[PDB]
Amino acid sequence: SMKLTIPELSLVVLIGSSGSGKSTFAKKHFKPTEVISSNFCRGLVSDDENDQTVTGAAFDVLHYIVSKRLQLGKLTVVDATNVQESARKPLIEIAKDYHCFPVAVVFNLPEKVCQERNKNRTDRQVEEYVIRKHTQQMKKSIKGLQREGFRYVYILNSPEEVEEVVFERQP
Amino acid sequence: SMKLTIPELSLVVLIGSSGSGKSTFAKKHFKPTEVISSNFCRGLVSDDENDQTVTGAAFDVLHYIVSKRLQLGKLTVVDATNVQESARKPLIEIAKDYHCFPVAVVFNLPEKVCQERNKNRTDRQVEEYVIRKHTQQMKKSIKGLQREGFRYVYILNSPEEVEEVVFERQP
RNA sequence: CCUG
RNA sequence: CCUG
Numbered sequence A, B: 001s002m003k004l005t006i007p008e009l010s011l012v013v014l015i016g017s018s019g020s021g022k023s024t025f026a027k028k029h030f031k032p033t034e035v036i037s038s039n040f041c042r043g044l045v046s047d048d049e050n051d052q053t054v055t056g057a058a059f060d061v062l063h064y065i066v067s068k069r070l071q072l073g074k075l076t077v078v079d080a081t082n083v084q085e086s087a088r089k090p091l092i093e094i095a096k097d098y099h100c101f102p103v104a105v106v107f108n109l110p111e112k113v114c115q116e117r118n119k120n121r122t123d124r125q126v127e128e129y130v131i132r133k134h135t136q137q138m139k140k141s142i143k144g145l146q147r148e149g150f151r152y153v154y155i156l157n158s159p160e161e162v163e164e165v166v167f168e169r170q171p
Numbered sequence C, D: 001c002c003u004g
């Protein structure tokens, strides 16, 4: 059992490479409206979830949605890679503005697992160098997450640990 | 600040080398009866907090006290090094027996800091090899703490982070 | 210091 | 994929 305790008013930031299973995990554990996805936001602004050139607009939209949810006291899960500190920073700031608890859930999986999953995907794929970079960035990020402002930091170190997760929401 | 959230019913396990500041930290944040110290227990059984030969008796007494407190629903802080998995295991089990949440607070400080603190102590000192070993064991322990059963894992990565700590005890 |  |  991998029990992850979170407050009812949480901003849950998923941290993981492309192919690490973030979207699958979010669908398993949360309501669809609780999950806001950066790729979905690329689709909202451009019709194309794969379009990297609309990244700025997509994240502007994602951040705006997060802010409205937290204003209204609604638990929110950010489904994006979040492997760069510069990506996490504005999310921590929004949580701070609305007195919300930021939670980090890190998919600390071997690069090989993510590359294999990516190779077999039919929906969307990235190049191998992208997953190599994401995995390196994820690993470098782990130590400093608490200091960034994550009040709960949960690291999942294998697919077996990921599969075992159950969230306990505390009111 | 470094806010560490803990439930009202917690077993707080301090993890750190001799010289890492565990006892000083414990008295800043918790009342005296909330803190049970392994060295104090060596004193209870033998008159000598330094005596390594009475370690079995001392931990038998400490575990018994912890069990009585958790049975009565009283928050308890374990002031011992807790750098070996075999030392943490019985503590996790006692917490489980009494439906208490185990919390890890790790003093991830450089060996050098602990060594210099140790040299300037007038109350009690250990040999250099002891602190070198404890620091290695502490660092090797960090990754696996969640999987051992610690429901919250807090790592303090510098004296500055230690100084910023505020416990938020949740009703 | 759960005992080099 | 917060854009080699």
Ligand SMILES: Nc1nc2c(ncn2[C@@H]2O[C@H](COP(=O)(O)OP(=O)(O)OP(=O)(O)O)[C@@H](O)[C@H]2O)c(=O)[nH]1
Residues within 6 Å of the ligand: A016, A017, A018, A019, A020, A021, A022, A023, A024, A025, A039, A080, A081, A117, A118, A121, A162
């Ligand atoms: N066995 C198993 N496979 C998984 C799991 N999660 C994801 N996968 C596989 O990995 C592929 C990618 O999963 P996603 O959930 O889309 O991964 P992601 O982290 O959202 O990837 P990006 O959206 O590109 O960042 C899926 O199509 C699955 O085949 C899992 O929990 N268990």
Ligand SMILES: Nc1nc2c(ncn2[C@@H]2O[C@H](COP(=O)(O)OP(=O)(O)OP(=O)(O)O)[C@@H](O)[C@H]2O)c(=O)[nH]1
Residues within 6 Å of the ligand: B016, B017, B018, B019, B020, B021, B022, B023, B024, B025, B039, B080, B081, B117, B118, B120, B121, B159, B162
């Ligand atoms: N500057 C500074 N010194 C500290 C701090 N905490 C503890 N010290 C000093 O470090 C020395 C050791 O501190 P303790 O609190 O006894 O450390 P410990 O982890 O309990 O050590 P053991 O009981 O041998 O395991 C003492 O002389 C303290 O005054 C701190 O936060 N800042």
Ligand SMILES: [Mg+2]
Residues within 6 Å of the ligand: A022, A023, A024, A039, A079
């Ligand atoms: Mg996805």
Ligand SMILES: [Mg+2]
Residues within 6 Å of the ligand: B022, B023, B024, B039, B079
């Ligand atoms: Mg002490």
Ligand code: NA
Residues within 6 Å of the ligand: A056, A057, A060
């Ligand atoms: Na923009």
Ligand code: NA
Residues within 6 Å of the ligand: A050, A124, A125, A126, A127
């Ligand atoms: Na792509």
Ligand code: NA
Residues within 6 Å of the ligand: A111, A131, A132, A133, A135, A136
């Ligand atoms: Na890599």
Ligand code: NA
Residues within 6 Å of the ligand: A157, A158, A160, A161, B147
């Ligand atoms: Na494991």
Ligand code: NA
Residues within 6 Å of the ligand: B084, B085, B140, B141, B144
């Ligand atoms: Na260990």
